RNA sequence: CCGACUUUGUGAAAUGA
RNA sequence: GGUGAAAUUCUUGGAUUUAUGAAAGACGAACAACUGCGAAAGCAUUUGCCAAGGAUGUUUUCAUUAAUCAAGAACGAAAGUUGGGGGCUCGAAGACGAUCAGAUACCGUCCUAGUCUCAACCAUAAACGAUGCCGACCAGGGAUCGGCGGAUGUUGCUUAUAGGACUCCGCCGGCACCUUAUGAGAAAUCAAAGUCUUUGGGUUCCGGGGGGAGUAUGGUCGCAAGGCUGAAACUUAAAGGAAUUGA
């Protein structure tokens, strides 16, 4: 499942993404 | 107290054995004879062979 | 029982005995368990 | 690349079927997908027939046959060879 | 260890061919652990071949309660019947349908109980439609007629010719020339009889139906 | 004079239990790990013949002579194939010199049973 | 919290003497 | 108990095993199918009520009222989220026991949320026939499901027929299935993926090398996970499909 597990990393990082945005606020 | 049995080799069923070593043979037993019970024996045996037979009740099934 | 201290903390295992004179019994009275309540044990 | 028309399945008129447990290692596949046979095996082999039937207490006594219907998943089935690759013109015919 | 047991006379009411079912046993009567009531509910289950001393019921495991003890020698009273585990599994293919179905009845004698019977439907000779399924109607249809027979069959005297009518078939080969027109219905039984709820005691009631 | 013997012939091991004809009392049980030294032969269908001979020793010991198999599988939400010692049992306690009333197969099956032990994917061993 | 004595009478069986 | 094998575990405070009874909560075996119903998701114990639905039958009615549909709207498996109910089995997390060089895994033991019901969300699945919907024609056959029509010949039925079960024939309407090119195509294969360079029946959605990327951002629905919409820089000469020989 590459392309499953993948997305799931995207998924985590984009998660982590958001938390720094709203962080920066 | 178990008295050994002796059997005759009717016919040998075949050489079976993961490795090809113990054929695979149906012994009638001499002293009652309406006994066959099938059994796994080791080394060259031919048809008619009386087999000194320790236990009677372990016997091999079809492709043992 | 639970009273004073430099910072806010009970001191003392909260649970008390079910024979503990009146004036002592505060707290969790004979408490079985504590802890938020799982599995079978919260039936 | 497809390999099987019905599927490996034959689900049609269905958009989903009930699902069952391997015997041997209780993998979930549908019913439909599972290799099904329906063995009905004597309780004893003929090397014990008669010596049952000259100990049976009252004459005239049937033996028993283990009635059962096993469900095995696709590999379990190739691992047991209840089944096996066939050719792929073999693999067409369904008798 | 097996010195102090005692075994029992296991015997069968009289609405039976032969009697005399087997041999139990129990401790022997101290105080506190009385033998005679101490048990007082063994529970045996016997086949009615070797209760009416025929081999086409093989089947028919008959379940027999002990309701009471006679001096060396245990009383029995019916508890319930149903299939060896083989009769059944050889009853049902593919390529057919199964049709059952369960009620309540309670008889004269205030005894509750419960029937499971079922049936399986006929390939008539010269078929060639290699199935013989029913449209799920008239399997409803003759569910409901199995209801209604087996009810009025029951709610009779007792369990006594109630299992006077459990012994030769009667709710069986009566199912059938009541409901062929429908079909034909090849094995029809009634695969269990589940006592529900027994009544009482009846030291005098127990012992008309057994002697 | 008859007994009931509850042959629990699964795998892993054998139980031969021999029973009154009411189920309420133990006559005496002997398992096929009982009579040998390893965790794997405690399941060989030679366990079942000497565990099955020393079953028709003690039910002559004591008086009954013959014997109503209740043949059985682990039942449940397992397998419903008795063991590899249920045949061997059965041959055994025949031969050694008994009589076998009525044989029957009493393993449970469930009308549909819990969730079975393995998860979806099942024991990719 | 617990045991014994006490208010505390009547009679029945099972194990111990 | 467990496995190829073991132990953690339970066990002379009697485990496993036997029978009897109770309680709880889940699941509805076998019958069960190249079978039915459904817009898809999905739907198997019984009976009842409730309302709906395809097909068939029709010398009933209305008479173009129809097809497909940006916006908009309903349903939408599992998992998931909030809160009551329940807490059987199974079980992500977690802890142990083995395996191993390690083993955060496969194997086994205990087990939380969860698994079930209700109230409220979410809006995705390999949501698959990887095949939008309506329509026409074109090839053959026997099966099978539903209805209907036509035939004697017997019922473990029937106050006798009828009916019902079975057999033969034929119409529709289903899910399919088997042989064949005279067809198509990159081919596997397809009787519909055919009637296309001799190219047009209608309609909607959508793709333009592979990545980056379903990512950044902006918007918007959602409590949250998320969902819907969605680039560019820069990178690259192949990525991919079908089948053939080998290894
Ligand atoms: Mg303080
Ligand atoms: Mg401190
Ligand atoms: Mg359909
Ligand atoms: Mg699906
Ligand atoms: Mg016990
Ligand atoms: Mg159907
Ligand atoms: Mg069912
Ligand atoms: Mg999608
Ligand atoms: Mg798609
Ligand atoms: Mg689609
Ligand atoms: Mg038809
Ligand atoms: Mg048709
Ligand atoms: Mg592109
Ligand atoms: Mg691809
Ligand atoms: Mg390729
Ligand atoms: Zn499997």
């Keep these: 499942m590459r392309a499953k597990w993948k997305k799931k990393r995207m998924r985590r990082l984009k998660r982590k993404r958001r938390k720094m945005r709203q962080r920066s606020k | 107290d178990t008295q050994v049995k002796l059997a005759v080799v009717v016919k040998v069923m075949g050489r079976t054995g993961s490795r090809g070593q113990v054929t695979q043979v149906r012994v009638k037993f001499l002293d009652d004879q309406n006994r066959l019970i099938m059994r796994n024996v080791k080394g060259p045996v031919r048809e008619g062979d009386i087999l000194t037979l320790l236990e009677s009740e372990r016997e091999a099934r079809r492709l043992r | 029982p639970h009273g004073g201290g430099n910072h806010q903390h009970i001191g003392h295992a909260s649970t008390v005995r079910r024979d503990a004179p009146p004036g002592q019994k505060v707290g969790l009275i004979a408490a079985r368990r504590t802890g938020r309540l799982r599995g079978q044990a919260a039936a | 690349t497809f390999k099987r028309r019905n599927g490996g399945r034959n689900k049609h008129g269905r958009g989903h079927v009930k699902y069952i447990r391997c015997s041997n290692c209780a993998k979930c596949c549908p019913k439909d997908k599972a290799i099904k046979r329906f063995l009905v095996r004597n309780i004893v082999e003929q090397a014990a027939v008669r010596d049952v039937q000259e100990a049976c207490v009252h004459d005239g006594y049937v033996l028993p046959k283990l009635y059962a219907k096993v469900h095995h998943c696709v590999s379990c089935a190739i691992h047991a060879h209840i089944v096996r690759v066939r050719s792929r013109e073999n693999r067409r015919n369904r008798e | 260890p097996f010195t102090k047991k005692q075994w029992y006379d296991i015997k069968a009411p009289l609405l039976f061919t032969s009697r005399n079912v087997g041999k139990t046993l129990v401790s022997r009567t101290q105080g506190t652990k009385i033998a005679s009531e101490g048990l007082k509910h063994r529970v045996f289950e016997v086949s009615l071949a070797?209760?009416?001393?025929?081999?086409?019921?093989?089947?028919?495991?008959?379940?027999?309660?002990?309701?009471?003890?006679?001096?060396?020698?245990?009383?029995?009273?019916?508890?319930?019947?149903?299939?060896?585990?083989?009769?059944?599994?050889?009853?049902?293919?593919?390529?057919?349908?199964?049709?059952?179905?369960?009620?309540?009845?309670?008889?004269?004698?205030?005894?509750?109980?419960?029937?499971?019977?079922?049936?399986?439907?006929?390939?008539?000779?010269?078929?060639?439609?290699?199935?013989?399924?029913?449209?799920?109607?008239?399997?409803?249809?003759?569910?409901?007629?199995?209801?209604?027979?087996?009810?009025?069959?029951?709610?009779?005297?007792?369990?006594?010719?109630?299992?006077?009518?459990?012994?030769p078939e009667v709710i069986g080969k009566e199912i059938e020339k009541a409901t062929s027109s429908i079909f034909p219905l090849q094995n029809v039984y009634v695969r269990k009889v589940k006592i529900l709820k027994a009544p009482k005691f009846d030291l005098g009631k127990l012992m008309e139906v057994h002697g | 004079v008859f007994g009931?013997?509850?042959?629990?012939?699964?795998?892993?091991?054998?139980?031969?239990?021999?029973?009154?004809?009411?189920?309420?009392?133990?006559?005496?049980?002997?398992?096929?790990?009982?009579?040998?030294?390893?965790?794997?032969?405690?399941?060989?269908?030679?366990?079942?013949?000497?565990?099955?001979?020393?079953?028709?020793?003690?039910?002559?010991?004591?008086?009954?002579?013959?014997?109503?198999?209740?043949?059985?599988?682990?039942?449940?939400?397992?397998?419903?194939?008795?063991?590899?010692?249920?045949?061997?049992?059965?041959?055994?306690?025949?031969?050694?010199?008994?009589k076998i009333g009525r044989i029957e197969d009493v393993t449970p099956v469930p009308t549909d049973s819990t969730r079975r032990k393995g998860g979806r994917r099942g024991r990719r061993l």
């Design chain 5, 50 to 167: 070797d209760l009416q001393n025929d081999e086409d019921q093989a089947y028919r495991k008959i379940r027999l309660r002990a309701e009471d003890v006679q001096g060396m020698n245990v009383l029995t009273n019916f508890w319930g019947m149903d299939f060896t585990t083989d009769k059944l599994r050889s009853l049902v293919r593919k390529w057919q349908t199964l049709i059952e179905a369960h009620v309540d009845v309670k008889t004269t004698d205030n005894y509750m109980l419960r029937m499971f019977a079922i049936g399986f439907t006929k390939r008539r000779p010269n078929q060639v439609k290699r199935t013989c399924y029913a449209q799920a109607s008239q399997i409803r249809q003759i569910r409901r007629k199995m209801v209604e027979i087996m009810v009025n069959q029951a709610a009779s005297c007792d369990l006594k010719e109630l299992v006077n009518k459990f012994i």
């Design chain 6, 4 to 98: 009931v013997a509850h042959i629990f012939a699964s795998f892993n091991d054998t139980f031969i239990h021999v029973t009154d004809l009411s189920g309420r009392e133990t006559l005496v049980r002997i398992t096929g790990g009982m009579k040998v030294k390893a965790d794997r032969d405690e399941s060989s269908p030679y366990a079942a013949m000497l565990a099955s001979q020393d079953v028709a020793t003690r039910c002559k010991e004591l008086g009954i002579t013959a014997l109503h198999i209740k043949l059985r599988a682990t039942g449940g939400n397992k397998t419903k194939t008795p063991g590899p010692g249920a045949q061997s049992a059965l041959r055994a306690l025949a031969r050694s010199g008994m």
